[PDB]
Amino acid sequence: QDVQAFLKENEEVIDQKMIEKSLNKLYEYIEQSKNCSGYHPKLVVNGRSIDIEYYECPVKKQQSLMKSMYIQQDLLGATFQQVDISDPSRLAMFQHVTDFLKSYNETGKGKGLYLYGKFGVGKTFMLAAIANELAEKEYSSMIVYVPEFVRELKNSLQDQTLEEKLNMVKTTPVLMLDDIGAESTSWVRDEVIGTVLQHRMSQQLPTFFSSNFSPDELKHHFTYEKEEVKAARLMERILYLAAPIRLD
Amino acid sequence: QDVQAFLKENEEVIDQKMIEKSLNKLYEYIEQSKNCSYCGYHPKLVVNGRSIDIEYYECKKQQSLMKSMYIQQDLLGATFQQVDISDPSRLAMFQHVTDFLKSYNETGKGKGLYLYGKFGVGKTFMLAAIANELAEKEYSSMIVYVPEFVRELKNSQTLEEKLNMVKTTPVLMLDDIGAESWVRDEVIGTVLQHRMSQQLPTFFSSNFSPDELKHHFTYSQEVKAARLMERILYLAAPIRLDGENRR
């Protein structure tokens, strides 16, 4: 009922066929729960690929703490009593929130989580849930938006410009990284947002890590011998700051 | 003329070119001919993908448009009158038969029904209420026991001539589904995928409420588990059947 509308809206742009190529996507789309009403997902055409951007809900004392860059403040507001649990493993999370603030101090160490799904499975309400309570106190879990962050963190690592806004992805007691896999020079893997993984298990910090998809399969994604038994160990460099749980 | 009726039914799916491609089918469809004789099926149009195909549905003068195998027909004492507008059941069960009795045959777009609730009420007295008085509107309907067919295709030489006649005729009333790796998806779970480009209704009866029927098909550890139950929530209208002990 939405796809039809979008299709004809951009049918001048959206080359044809593909259905069979994106079969997996469209089938996974219908198979899942999907749906939604601080933001909403909308499709956008970026070059030759179609992405999913969040626009603030038109329906629009923690946000002096909960200020995240490269995403807006209309769409950061979800709690834990705002709870109508319908799908499974959204239930298997009632000891990874209340007990994910009682011992996540400053250099507490261990294993958080690895959120995933497709492109909008109430992720911005669980990365907005679990965290709030940490910052409801003087504890830690920074919000950050990677697909928007990096867009100039290739060409802003310069003359103090963003140089000085970009050492705090390494030193805040905790910090999250969002829907990477969106786009991507390969230096940022080990210079901008791969510099989040070595300086956080060397002094060790209880950091959150999210994504469009999962670490166990984010190990073979980018091959547009090398990164196969070599693309797995960044999902390993990921695997130790957190303990993975389902999002069915 | 048959093509016109089917088109409006599947006009959301069919395109102008689809019409000219399936011309032979739609033209063969018409020819007036109401049907066959005996001595068993009738031709109906069923768009496959980008092509429209022709599938055969199986065929004191009312219950003849209402034959049955595997169950009984003495039970057909389950009609419109003595069964009264009683519960959330029959405050909406005869209506979604009669609002439809004015739009019968294959023309405009369509659905079926679904039957559930709890003990004692009915699933076999309301699929016999979209039936015998449908032997009054030029188009016949069906009464067949789905579970009575689930113990002979494990133990059954041409059995690829049987399932192309009991699924693409004017009406489907796939009975009770909710008891006891499932061939159900070839036997009962592929009684839907040709009812798309051929436009064919799927009435069902069952055992569980509308938040419960997607979990009776195999257990392990889903992305594939509810394929049918989405296609068995669209081509119909489900209502709350709960009244007195009439079973």
UniProtKB/Swiss-Prot annotation, chain B:
InterPro entries: AAA+_ATPase, DnaA_dom, DnaI_N, P-loop_NTPase
Effect annotated for changing residue 39 to A: Loss of Zn(2+) binding, very weakly interacts with helicase
Region (C-terminal domain (Cd)): 86-247
Keywords from the UniProt entry: ATP-binding, Cytoplasm, DNA replication, DNA-binding, Hydrolase, Metal-binding, Nucleotide-binding, Primosome, Zinc
SUPFAM superfamilies cross-referenced by the UniProt entry: P-loop containing nucleoside triphosphate hydrolases
A GO MF term: ATP binding
Region (N-terminal domain (Nd)): 1-85
Chain residues that bind ATP: 117-124
Cofactor(s) demanded: Zn(2+)
Gene Ontology CC: one annotated term: cytoplasm
Subcellular location: Cytoplasm
Phenotype on disruption: Essential, it cannot be deleted; in depletion experiments DNA replication slows as soon as the protein is degraded and replication stops by 1 hour.
NCBIfam families noted in UniProt: PRK08939.1 (NF006505)
Described function: Helps load the DnaC replicative helicase onto single-stranded (ss)DNA and simulates the helicase activity; in the presence of DnaB more helicase activity is seen. Regulates DnaC helicase activity, at low concentrations stimulates the DNA helicase and ATPase activities of DnaC. Has no measurable ATPase activity after 1 hour incubation of 6 uM DnaI with or without DNA. Another group has found the protein has weak ATPase activity that is not stimulated by ssDNA.
Record remark on domains: The N-terminal domain (approximately residues 1-136, Nd) interacts with helicase DnaC and has a Zn(2+) cofactor. The C-terminal domain (approximately residues 137-311, Cd) has ATPase activity. The ATPase activity of the Cd (not whole protein) is stimulated by ssDNA; Cd has a cryptic DNA-binding site that is masked by the Nd. The CTD binds both ssDNA and forked DNA.
Family: Belongs to the DnaI family.
Binding partners and assembly: The DNA replisome assembles sequentially on oriC in this order; DnaA, DnaD, DnaB, DnaI-DnaC helicase. Monomer with a very minor amount of dimer in solution. Interacts with replicative helicase (from G.stearothermophilus, called DnaB); this interaction is disrupted by DnaD. Interacts with replicative helicase DnaC, forms a DnaC(6):DnaI(6) complex. Interacts with the helicase as 3 dimers. A stable complex with DnaG primase, DnaI(6):helicase(6):DnaG(3) fragment can be isolated; DnaI and DnaG do not contact each other (helicase and DnaG in this complex are derived from G.stearothermophilus).
PANTHER family given in the database record: CHROMOSOMAL REPLICATION INITIATOR PROTEIN DNAA, PRIMOSOMAL PROTEIN DNAI
Name of the protein described by the UniProt record: Replicative helicase loader DnaI
Organism: Bacillus subtilis (strain 168)
